[PDB]
Ligand SMILES: Nc1nc2c(ncn2[C@@H]2O[C@H](COP(=O)(O)OP(=O)(O)O)[C@@H](O)[C@H]2O)c(=O)[nH]1
Ligand SMILES: Nc1nc2c(ncn2[C@@H]2O[C@H](COP(=O)(O)OP(=O)(O)O)[C@@H](O)[C@H]2O)c(=O)[nH]1
Ligand SMILES: O=P(O)(O)OC[C@H]1O[C@@H](n2cnc3c(OP(=O)(O)O)ncnc32)[C@H](O)[C@@H]1O
Ligand SMILES: O=P(O)(O)OC[C@H]1O[C@@H](n2cnc3c(OP(=O)(O)O)ncnc32)[C@H](O)[C@@H]1O
């Protein structure tokens with residue numbers, strides 16, 4: 001009994017937007033604590049409940065549950081204006097008293113306005129220099145994580161202690177950035193004044209995260225859910241570097257982002273989209289830039305929530321999925337957006353990569369290889385039926401069931417949930 | 432199914448607890464010894480058969496010829512330093528090392544200009560705020576900073592198209608010259624050396640994720656993970672900003688090797704019988720008096736190689752409890768017990784008081800630690816030489832009580848007790 005309760009984790013198995021918001025929301029209906037451990041508002045998690053659609057970024061998807069406490073861990077990078085802008089957008093949607101059930105770890109870093117600006121600048125510069133950038137969301141994520149590593153970045157506890165010292169620190173950080181980009185513009189006083197206001201507003205929600213999570217896991221039994229952001233193949237260490245985000249999206253980030261040891265990690269769910277999508281620049285072996293790709297974008301609404309920019313779509317790729325499983329060790333899968341495939345007569349899924357007719361042994365650490373590989377596909381018969389109303393395993397048509405099995409079998413992990421729709425009820429639990 | 436679990440050795444305080452000594456001892460029956468985070472800012476001493484080694488990038492297990500040393504993807508590597516370290520040990524007998532050393536191809540590269548920029552930033556800090564971090568000036572902070580920026584270059588990039596590697600190298604070096612127009616950088620010179628290192632290292636490089644995954648799912652093997660730096664030096668959980676730039680805690684094992692938590696077995700906390708730290712930053716139990724001089728002297732607490740004297744103080748349970756909360760230590764290795772062989776009494780910090788009132792947990796704001804008053808418990812010393820102890824019964828009654836004390840106050844069993852620098856100078860209790 002020395003260990004304590006174990007947290008349940010929801011992670012992205014591909015390149016993001018797999019449906020983490022939907023899955024977390026489903027599992028949070030009876031959770032005591034729902035939390036974020038890494039990333040920032042570069043993430044976007046859609047939740048649909050009772051004909052009401054929510055859009056979360058920094059707020060844990062469970063913020064909807066009024067009887068649960070939403071928690072932002074030390075691994076997350078916070079942009080205060082964005083944080084509150086997100087809250088008010090959702091307030092106008094029925095979200096009430098969120099500030100009373102939201103706890104923020106005082107060790108989390110802060111994304112300053114100039115971090116986002118420098119993100120835009122680097123992106124543009126890298127574009128006019130090497131004719132290709134990363135495709136960042138420009139939310140200042142990379143620069144803030146860069147400031148973290150340098151130990152020059154500022155944290156929540158800093159913003160809450162003596163403001164005079166915080167200002168001095170802020171100014172210094174600001175300068176070091178204007179040096180980086182002499183073109184960078186920073187109204188230090190205007191931003192410190194806004195930050196002064198955010199401090200007051202955020203003060204009552206702040207707490208020591210390490211202690212908060214410890215007590216939660218070692219006192220009376222509680223259900224703790226951890227919502228990962230971004231995805232396995234976007235992981236700073238294991239993704240398609242450098243075309244990745246700047247945090248660990250894989251399982252390890254749960255430990256480093258909340259300060260809990262491995263023995264306090266229970267079920268780890270891998271959310272896998274029935275087909276593959278990507279947003280920024282980077283290799284994408286199964287990318288269909290054709291009628292099929294167009295059919296998946298439209299049927300899957302694959303485009304930026306505010307930007308409208310269409311996401312790149314492709315067939316399910318088992319190579320990245322098995323690789324993702326190697327690092328995350330999923331205990332079960334959530335196969336989402338199956339209904340998208342209701343219209344195809346046949347479905348292709350990549351089973352391996354080839355170079356000179358021979359299957360390569362493992363996923364390439366060098367991104368450039370992925371561009372030179374030939375994807376070996378297997379063609380499965382479609383079900384040409386509406387699974388949208390399916391609520392139980394038996395309601396799925398033979399070819400749909402077979403599709404699910406194909407995923408389980410080849411990954412070596414059992415499918416626990418099948419998504420057939422955007423809303424919370426549009427789900428099938430297999431066990 | 433799940434596969435075998437790795438054994439982990441982590442620093443529980445502010446570094447230099449004797450991780451090298453522990454890893455060397457455990458590596459005797461290990462098939463694979465690996466590093467998961469950090470770089471050569473780390474310094475680990477191994478003492479065997481009248482030979483004293485000091486490793487930095489090479490896993491402490493490199494000494495065991497029948498085992499495979501592995502450097503994971505979380506480590507930042509400085510090629511020049513790597514081979515200089517390998518050569519300094521070759522002159523000590525380390526032979527065929529390049530035959531039992533594998534390098535993960537996702538590990539990042541610490542370039543010469545990263546080391547220069549490190550000291551440059553450190554010298555600038557001291558000029559502005561008249562206070563810097565206390566970095567080892569090995570460029571670990573700047574390299575990790577480039578990684579997060581996805582601007583840094585990796586092992587696999589080095590061994591791929593060199594023309595490509597060169598252009599990226601150049602852009603990277605320029606961006607750093609903007610940071611400090613004072614910075615030089617002999618681009619062609621450095622690129623030239625790198626092209627050479629590329630080949631020298633190429634045969635040792637492999638895919639880390641696959642290498643480790645197969646090692647844990649194939650024929651049963653014993654994997655040992657050597658941590659670097661320490662819990663209170665953790666980029667997330669340490670005394671930020673006075674910390675190193677990588678996760679020194681257990682989670683770093685997962686991010687630095689690509690293995691899930693279910694493949695993590697025993698996690699050992701190396702805790703020195705007294706506390707030390709080198710560099711700037713709060714140190715609540717620090718003893719700037721005759722006591723400190725005695726610990727530093729008897730404990731030879733001075734720069735492994737950097738040459739900087741370490742700050743010393745009494746054992747501190749506040750930082751050990753906090754470290755445990757984060758690392759989930761399954762057992763402890765209490766080192767340098769023999770340093771206390773002469774003390775009549777030994778104080779141990781049990782809690783911190785702020786304005787006369789105890790605080791509930793270790794503070795996120797390092798500035799608070801700067802004002803706390805430590806509450807001590809004074810224990811009796813044994814005043815006898817324990818250097819020759821090889822068994823629990825060899826320890827005098829009061830030395831045993833010191834061990835139990837630590838074990839009872841932490842709720843974690845002490846599995847090893849160090850009584851000397853050498854490998855045999857250890858007592859296994861469990
Ligand atoms: N039709 C359909 N849409 C789904 C399903 N699961 C999720 N979605 C939608 O697909 C999108 C997933 O993107 P996003 O919300 O960014 O996922 P996240 O970033 O992983 O949380 C959302 O708009 C969801 O409403 C499903 O099973 N069927
Ligand atoms: N006398 C004595 N010295 C020890 C003992 N354990 C370790 N040491 C020495 O303490 C020092 C610890 O520094 P270091 O090697 O940097 O530790 P690491 O960085 O944690 O591997 C080394 O010089 C060791 O030889 C012990 O039980 N007794
Ligand atoms: O520096 P960044 O702004 O993080 O961008 C770097 C790279 O990461 C990708 N990316 C970042 N967050 C993403 C997301 O999050 P969720 O799955 O949580 O909704 N879903 C999809 N792609 C995402 C971007 O497309 C880009 O290539
Ligand atoms: O950017 P860095 O060069 O990492 O310096 C930042 C801070 O971290 C400390 N530090 C870093 N590695 C250390 C080490 O490692 P081992 O226990 O593995 O031998 N032992 C002790 N102190 C160590 C430095 O003294 C400094 O205050």
Ligand SMILES: [Mg+2]
Nearest residue numbers: 017043044045
């Ligand atoms: Mg999204």
Ligand SMILES: [Mg+2]
Nearest residue numbers: 447473474475
């Ligand atoms: Mg050391």
